[PDB]
A paper describes a structure:
P-type ATPases are transmembrane proteins that play a key role in the uphill transport of a wide range of cations across membranes using the energy provided by the hydrolysis of ATP, being crucial for the ion homeostasis in nearly all organisms and for heavy metal detoxification. HMA1 and HMA6 are found in the inner membrane of the chloroplast envelope and HMA8 in the thylakoid membrane. Here, we present two structures of the nucleotide binding domain of HMA6 and HMA8, the former at the highest resolution, obtained for any P-type ATPase structure. The overall structure of HMA6N-AA and HMA8N (respectively) exhibits a twisted, antiparallel β-sheet made of six strands being flanked by two pairs of short α-helices, one on the concave (α1 and α2) and one on the convex (α3 and α4) side of the sheet.
HMA8 supplies plastocyanin in the thylakoid lumen with copper, which also controls the stability of HMA8, but not of HMA6. However, they exhibit differing catalytic properties, HMA8 having a higher affinity for Cu and lower dephosphorylation kinetics than HMA6. The N-domain of HMA8 (HMA8N) was readily expressed and purified, representing monomeric protein, which eluted as a symmetric peak with a calculated mass of 17.2 kDa. For both proteins, two molecules are present in the AU, yet they are monomeric in solution as found by size exclusion chromatography. The position of the second missing loop is identical in both structures, differing only in the length, as in HMA8 an insertion is present, not typically found in the subfamily. Furthermore, the insertion found in HMA8 could interact tighter with the P-domain and report on the N-domain inclination. In parallel, several attempts to obtain the structure of the HMA N-domains in complex with ATP were made by soaking or co-crystallization on HMA8N. They led to diffracting crystals but no density of the nucleotide could be observed. Of interest is also a second salt bridge in the vicinity of the nucleotide binding domain, E673-R697 in HMA6 and E612-R637 in HMA8, linking β2 to α3. Marked differences between ATP/ADP ratios in the cytosol and the chloroplast stroma, as well as between the pH of these two subcellular compartments (increase of the stromal alkalization on illumination), might also explain differences in electrostatic properties of this surface (HMA8 requires the efficient use of ATP at a low ATP/ADP ratio found in the stroma).
Numbering used by the authors: 558 to 656, 669 to 688
Write the structure that this text describes.
């Protein structure tokens, strides 16, 4: 179980991974470990977090530098924040992923900002 790809919209790939690994820091599940290991393997410094919410089978949320960030399934990440992504952004993101699990990444005030493909 390893990261196979990082999809983003306006963000740098590294920024999406850094945020996702910050949220996934202490999750024990092999997928979360892989996101963390990839940020580690690439020598990425993850931002600090105090506090997190984990919803088993859905995802994990934590505040990163003053904004909440959620990592998990598409619907649960999308539902976490009032800001929703344009329909064209969803097509673009899904078109890239369509070309193995996908973990989505979202941020309050922005909606979905990226996704991590796992193999």
């Amino acid at each position: 179980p390893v990261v196979s790809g990082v999809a983003s919209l306006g963000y740098e790939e590294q920024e999406v991974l850094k945020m996702a690994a910050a949220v996934e820091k202490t999750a024990t599940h092999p997928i979360a470990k892989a996101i963390v290991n990839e940020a580690e393997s690439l020598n990425l410094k993850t931002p600090e977090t105090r506090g997190q919410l984990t919803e088993p089978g859905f995802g994990t949320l934590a505040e990163i530098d003053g904004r909440f960030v959620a990592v998990g399934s598409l619907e649960w990440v999308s539902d976490r924040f009032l800001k929703k992504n344009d329909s064209s952004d969803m097509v673009k993101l899904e078109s890239l992923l369509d070309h193995k699990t996908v973990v989505y990444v979202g941020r309050e005030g922005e909606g979905i900002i990226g996704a991590i493909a796992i193999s």
